[PDB]
Design a protein around this ligand. Sequence first.
Ligand code: CLA
Ligand code: CLA
Ligand code: CLA
Ligand code: CLA
Ligand SMILES: CC1=C(/C=C/C(C)=C/C=C/C(C)=C/C=C/C=C(C)/C=C/C=C(C)/C=C/C2=C(C)CCCC2(C)C)C(C)(C)CCC1
Ligand SMILES: CC1=C(/C=C/C(C)=C/C=C/C(C)=C/C=C/C=C(C)/C=C/C=C(C)/C=C/C2=C(C)CCCC2(C)C)C(C)(C)CCC1
Ligand SMILES: CC1=C(C/C=C(\C)CCC[C@H](C)CCC[C@H](C)CCCC(C)C)C(=O)c2ccccc2C1=O
Ligand code: SF4
Ligand code: SF4
Lengths: 100, 37, 80, 144, 93, 73, 159
Amino acid sequence: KYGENSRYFDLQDMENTTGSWDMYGVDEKKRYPDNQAKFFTQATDIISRRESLRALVALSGIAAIVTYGLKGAKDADLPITKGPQTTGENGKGGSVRSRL
Amino acid sequence: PFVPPSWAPSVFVPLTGLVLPAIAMATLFVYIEKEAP
Amino acid sequence: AHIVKIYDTCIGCTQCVRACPLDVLEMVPWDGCKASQMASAPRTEDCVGCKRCETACPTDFLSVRVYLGSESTRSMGLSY
Amino acid sequence: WTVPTLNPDTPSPIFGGSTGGLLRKAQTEEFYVITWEAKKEQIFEMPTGGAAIMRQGPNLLKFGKKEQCLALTTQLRNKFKLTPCFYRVFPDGKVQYLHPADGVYPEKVNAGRVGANQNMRRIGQNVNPIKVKFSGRMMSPAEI
Amino acid sequence: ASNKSFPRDWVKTDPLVPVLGFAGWTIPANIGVSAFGGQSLFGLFTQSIGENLAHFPTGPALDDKFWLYLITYHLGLFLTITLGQIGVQGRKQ
Amino acid sequence: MFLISWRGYWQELIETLVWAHEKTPLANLVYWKDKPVALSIVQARLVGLAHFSVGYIFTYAAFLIASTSGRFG
Amino acid sequence: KKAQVISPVNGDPFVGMLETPVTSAPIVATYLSNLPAYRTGVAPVLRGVEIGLAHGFLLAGPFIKLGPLRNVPETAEIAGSLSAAGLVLILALCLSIYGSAQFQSTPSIGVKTLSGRSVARDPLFSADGWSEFAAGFLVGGEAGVAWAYVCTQILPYYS
Ligand code: CLA
Ligand code: CLA
Ligand code: CLA
Ligand code: CLA
Ligand SMILES: CC1=C(/C=C/C(C)=C/C=C/C(C)=C/C=C/C=C(C)/C=C/C=C(C)/C=C/C2=C(C)CCCC2(C)C)C(C)(C)CCC1
Ligand SMILES: CC1=C(/C=C/C(C)=C/C=C/C(C)=C/C=C/C=C(C)/C=C/C=C(C)/C=C/C2=C(C)CCCC2(C)C)C(C)(C)CCC1
Ligand SMILES: CC1=C(C/C=C(\C)CCC[C@H](C)CCC[C@H](C)CCCC(C)C)C(=O)c2ccccc2C1=O
Ligand code: SF4
Ligand code: SF4
């Protein structure tokens, strides 16, 4: 027997003598009030598979980034059609020879 | 007869900066870890 | 698994066996030298390739070689 | 000498509990189990760190890899002059015997051994690697 | 060895360790020296605790002569309790 | 780094990391599929050389373009 | 002197862990039992939405306060919330491909509790359970970040 006077390594009882314990894992039901099971399992019915939510993230990622291109014009700090409102360094190019 | 539109960097840059790396890395990562039957 | 091969210049001095930290070498009877022994490698699936057998061999260019090969979970010495 | 099995009700040496014990190579793949019979109580050194006290009589431990059992075997053998034996245990109840696996530790030659991986030529009588080229896989010329 | 299961009482709660801790350290912590002009190390920053409790949401100034009172007060309060707990001489001294 | 400090040190460090991620609560729910090991002896030479060459090239290119085009450009 | 606190795990000094009042103190043990990641009797979808609701709501903050749109008034909240929703999206993708890579083969052999009895295996650790958990995470995280925006807009002395 394993749990005895220093009699370790019980051969037929491998799940003690090995180090396979659930440290903090309780198991009981009724953690939640009942109808969230209804409201959330009837809500995640669509994307409950491997390909489904993986398609959803593709759809949303595309439909977010591609529209970020042409309606992320909320100043983006500089580039998006706010541009150089001064002729910045056109003729300033070189130090000894100007070169434009 | 060929010209890309004015809005073309705004769309094509984050596409190839964020989307194609994401699809590439996810697809390759599924490919790497697959078990042979 | 690695490749461990014993050659015929062996004089059978048991140095390689006492140097192996994994017990993959053993001495077998043989009729080719004065000591009437020769090393052998019956368990090269436990070898990790540390090459202490090569260091312990007295005869010049060695009578035992360890060729490195495809690693496994035992030939990497991983304890986790 | 026949191949012995172990008796898994032998006590274990007194030890406090290290970090360096069994990880999950034991839960899924394998772990090794060593056994010896002592004569008087004495303090030895674990091949993980720390010191332990062996008991008067049979003992029993368990380890992760094989070099740990060989280290403890060499230490118990050259310093205390005892006779240890360590096994391999798979995580479903399968026990394999090894070391010595011949009765006699593999330095004293025991008649009745078959020599394997044992080429019969001088080291400089190998073929060139052009003449073993284009085979099923990577091959050293001294592997043929 | 060390043990076989973790004891679920390791802090052996002796109920008069803390009351003697801060009660037997603060009754001599408010004496009154020449050093402060007639004030204590428990009433002089009672003034402070209440003082910047008055204007509440303003966190008090980062050089205001009472952080010293907080730190030097707890530097002794914790010490007297941690030496009180080793007043578990039930098996040692 | 890959040139000066050779391997086995990193092997031991990575092993303690394996222990830490194995015994940490609430993060022992995610495991490696292939066991983590340190880079092999041959590979790290190539990697160190790659960093050496790439940094060397980028530094000199930056200096050359910036200096010559800052003066005459 | 015949007093000790620190013990090896369930006797057994030869498993590489040792018990401490950090790991096995009673209040800590009951606390980490009551977290959603250790409950084992509930369906993984619901855990997914609980964990997602928590993590989205916390992830919204730093983008709001420290993002590049943090000084322009009334729109500093929008950009932060949107970016946080993006991060939650990427986390959902990571969960999905982890499910595709980890549980792709056979499971382990056996499990017992600490005060030994043979407890069954957690259903979160199969392909279906993990995929459902990922879907729950996406739903919960997006709901959480949306709630972060909502909570910003109507809250007594937010600043
Ligand atoms: C191979 C040479 C090459 C290189 C290095 C670049 C580099 C660049 N292009 Mg580009 N481009 C090229 C050829 C190239 N172009 C050709 C031939 C066309 C005509 C179809 C375009 C049309 C084009 C547009 C319309 C735009 C760019 C833009 C850009 C810039 C942003 C990156 C990007 O989104 O690219 C996107 C590039 C493409 C969509 C064209 C690539 C088409 C081929 C078939 C792909 C090649 C695959 C590649 C070899 C595999 C590598 C990946 C692998 C390692 C996994 C970048 C400077 C953007 C820009 O100017 O921003 C300022 C932009 O909006 N490119
Ligand atoms: C903290 C110290 C430090 C260190 C370690 C480095 C490290 C580096 N710098 Mg550097 N740098 C630093 C501070 C530092 N920098 C500072 C503070 C400045 C001032 C802004 C610079 C300015 C600077 C410039 C301008 C350049 C570097 C370059 C380099 C790289 C040279 C690597 C190499 O292979 O050289 C090998 C070294 C040589 C081949 C010779 C160096 C020049 C010698 C003295 C004269 C040339 C030889 C001569 C013509 C022939 C004589 C040979 C004979 C003796 C046999 C390397 C990454 C250079 C680079 O990119 O590398 C190509 C480069 O162009 N850095
Ligand atoms: C590692 C150091 C470091 C740090 C702290 C920052 C910090 C920052 N960078 Mg930054 N940056 C860095 C390195 C760093 N940078 C480097 C190396 C680069 C070059 C590659 C950049 C390039 C860069 C750019 C280009 C930009 C920033 C920006 C920013 C700001 C916003 C970022 C943001 O939204 O965070 C997101 C927030 C999080 C991910 C929060 C996670 C952290 C949580 C709070 C930890 C909580 C731990 C908690 C205590 C655990 C308790 C557990 C308990 C409850 C049980 C922020 C001030 C942006 C900006 O506008 O700056 C103002 C911006 O545009 N950075
Ligand atoms: C070519 C690649 C590339 C591109 C295009 C970008 C683009 C961007 N980066 Mg970025 N980055 C990159 C590589 C890249 N990065 C790399 C390699 C690093 C690591 C070194 C970083 C690190 C970095 C930091 C640290 C930060 C950025 C930020 C940003 C944004 C700055 C724009 C701005 O002013 O904020 C305006 C921002 C917005 C308007 C928010 C938009 C949020 C996304 C795009 C929309 C999501 C839509 C929604 C979630 C979909 C709904 C899903 C549905 C299920 C509900 C912009 C989106 C900043 C940022 O966004 O963080 C706040 C920032 O702080 N970057
Ligand atoms: C800062 C300051 C100060 C002070 C200082 C001090 C005061 C110090 C001290 C300290 C101390 C001094 C501490 C200690 C204390 C202690 C105590 C108080 C103890 C007690 C004990 C007891 C009570 C015991 C009891 C018992 C028991 C428990 C059982 C039975 C038996 C016997 C008896 C053992 C002054 C004044 C200058 C001023 C103000 C500021
Ligand atoms: C205990 C503890 C702690 C911690 C704490 C914490 C960390 C907390 C956090 C918390 C949190 C962070 C929380 C969060 C929450 C969230 C929420 C609560 C949300 C909600 C939302 C909602 C509810 C929504 C809904 C909706 C909408 C509106 C949209 C969509 C649709 C629907 C309807 C779904 C401390 C440190 C103190 C101490 C130690 C221990
Ligand atoms: C740091 C270090 C390690 C540890 C290195 C590790 C554990 C790997 C670190 C790489 C991380 C995991 C990712 C690095 C991020 C890169 C961008 C990955 C690029 C991958 C390519 C396919 C693009 C060694 O193993 C080593 C061995 C021999 C000599 C020197 C060293 C050494 O210096
Ligand atoms: S390499 Fe090491 S393990 Fe292999 S045979 Fe030689 S000594 Fe033994
Ligand atoms: S050390 Fe060399 S010579 Fe000696 S027994 Fe071994 S192989 Fe033979």
